[PDB]
């Protein structure tokens with residue numbers, strides 16, 4: 120597999136302006152006719168190089184003349200000796216039933232559906248499969264009427280007919296030019312939830328949600344979330360939908376989460392289907408986020424698209440930022456920010472410290488599907504948010520407006536977006552641009568001094584980004600570094616120097632710099648990197664008392680949570696070292712007291728209390744360490760939970776009871792109280808065994824919603840309670856027919872602390888609810904084991920690695936994209952001890968030797984073994 124490089128981008132020799140597709144649909148053999156209007160822009164002697172994969176070419180015509188001047192090569196059809204303008208007609212065959220990779224046109228149960236991003240359209244026909252080629256599409260679909268009563272593509276229906284032998288057809292037209300990655304086709308039999316949204320300016324939009332027959336009871340929340348998304352984009356960004364219909368199709372077989380195809384989004388059913396007995400609060404809020412995300416792409420991705428795939432973050436970072444702002448505006452901003460920071464500091468930082476590290480705008484890509492990453496998405500959004508921090512909302516919106524004014528109807532670059540923000544706001548972002556080109560996590564070190572003679576407070580701030588495998592050279596970034604200073608009363612000290620106020624967002628642009636503040640009338644307790652103002656690691660020598668002070672007094676709820684994290688970090692590190700020495704947990708009384716205070720604080724938002732009372736995950740804990748000891752981390756997390764459960768037993772039970780809710784509502788105040796109640800239950804499960812068992816079994820049986828049922832089930836598994844096996848069997852018996860519900864159960868099995876977890880996981884490959892043909896099942900059982908049970912995955916006998924190798928040997932051939940998701944835990948080998956590294960290296964070498972090794976895996980394996 121050959122690497123492609125950002126610096127090699129060149130405008131295409133040919134454009135296509137219009138394409139008319141006809142599909143003669145059949146699961147075994149689909150015949151595609153594609154009539155494209157093409158224009159040469161390059162040299163008169165330049166051939167047309169069309170991309171195509173696994174196509175059976177039937178014919179090639181140019182202006183209806185059968186063409187002789189062509190050749191097929193690896194991945195391409197090369198057509199020579201062309202006029203400056205011409206009509207290209209290609210007929211080819213494809214086989215949806217044979218498509219196990221789920222890229223291009225494939226089968227999802229009885230439905231046929233497409234996934235074209237990034238480079239899937241070339242699996243459908245020979246085309247200029249690159250996003251700077253935008254064309255107006257017309258799509259005619261012919262199919263068996265009984266099997267495929269609904270025939271959907273982008274845009275509006277412009278024609279329909281019936282044919283002999285039980286076939287029918289529908290033709291669609293989408294007036295907006297698009298790159299082919301936004302093409303979609305769906306054929307099948309569905310229940311359809313129909314609604315309307317009227318835009319601010321009065322455009323009536325038909326909303327249509329297509330689900331498998333029998334799933335209409337699980338559709339209204341997604342529909343509600345779509346309308347919420349439409350309203351919010353109007354209110355916050357001033358953006359309206361631009362077409363007459365908005366279709367969403369929920370499919371069970373889907374590699375990713377969802378896809379923003381123009382006017383015809385295709386969603387993994389996991390991000391559509393919800394009812395109160397099948398879906399948790401988290402599922403509801405995820406459906407809201409993902410519905411919003413795909414909707415927000417209508418402008419940030421579709422109306423303005425990407426010039427090339429290296430510019431992916433142009434749409435993904437900005438659309439993730441938009442989905443975060445949507446969730447934060449409608450729900451709890453503090454909880455959203457906290458959770459997005461957890462994802463950054465734990466999961467994304469790990470990626471930036473791995474062999475797969477890349478800038479948010481990559482420079483080198485072998486398999487583009489490997490770059491739909493935490494970095495491109497989540498760090499991408501942090502970079503957009505830094506622009507927002509530097510500009511303020513007003514200037515940021517002016518930048519958005521200039522961006523659309525300049526680039527509407529075109530394919531643009533990350534740089535185009537930064538330039539729009541810079542030009543609209545008059546804020547210089549030249550240094551800032553380095554965030555797009557530099558990988559790795561900056562480390563920001565802060566030292567301070569208080570001078571009582573002069574009443575001056577001095578911050579000495581330094582930065583450095585360690586070299587990464589992809590980049591030997593690193594330079595200082597423009598880091599927006601937000602601070603607050605607190606006096607002894609917990610009041611904010613005004614920031615000023617020389618009689619003038621100073622902005623609280625410090626511009627940390629050098630390797631080292633000093634900031635001096637005057638009229639600091641008392642030695643401050645600083646809050647640093649407020650609201651995680653830059654995606655960086657903070658090094659500051661906190662005292663425990665400074666941190667507990669912040670937990671009490673910090674103005675922003677995020678700072679209170681963050682102070683608790685800093686406090687915990689010290690004792691997580693202490694106790695991991697102790698574990699390695701065979702010593703039990705040690706925790707100062709005053710640390711337990713800080714958490715007691717949180718439980719008993721009557722003024723604190725339950726949403727915030729719940730997050731403070733949610734311990735960092737084993738992945739968050741891992742990023743506190745250079746070399747990860749996954750067994751020590753798992754056991755310390757459990758020991759910390761048990762210690763807090765014992766010390767806070769009475770308070771935990773009181774708060775658990777106080778937050779009981781008889782009505783179930785998907786409403787933010789209710790969700791907050793329930794999150795707090797279940798956070799308490801988690802500790803209570805790890806307390807005295809009999810009380811724990813009674814509390815947990817009772818909640819499981821009495822729950823009137825899946826949030827509370829699953830919280831109880833999860834606690835029974837985590838604490839290995841007597842009731843565990845009974846409850847797990849009861850859930851299986853009730854829910855085995857429902858794959859999405861069983862995913863939760865597979866996750867609990869895969870992440871179990873039980874000694875025999877791998878044995879159980881292996882056996883579950885034969886479970887009635889499991890299948891290797893379904894990405895969701897694979898991720899929930901195998902993915903969760905390797906990625907979310909690092910203690911078992913990293914068993915010292917190497918059994919975890921061998922299991923993953925067996926699974927990847929299958930998946931490499933079946934579904935390389937899912938295989939590539941699942942190999943990720945293995946490529947982190949350098950974070951582990953020498954003995955584990957050698958077993959992981961051996962596993963990677965075995966995979967490197969596979970017959971027909973996919974490019975997806977090749978890219979990751981080669982980087983890992985370097």
Ligand SMILES: N[C@@H](CCCC[NH3+])C(=O)O
Nearest residue numbers: 236237375377378488491
């Ligand atoms: N554009 C989609 C992801 C496409 C995945 C391509 N392999 C989204 O952001 O949800």
Ligand code: NA
Nearest residue numbers: 447448450452
């Ligand atoms: Na809000």
Ligand code: NA
Nearest residue numbers: 566567568569
């Ligand atoms: Na100091």
Ligand SMILES: [Zn+2]
Nearest residue numbers: 412416435438
């Ligand atoms: Zn997206």
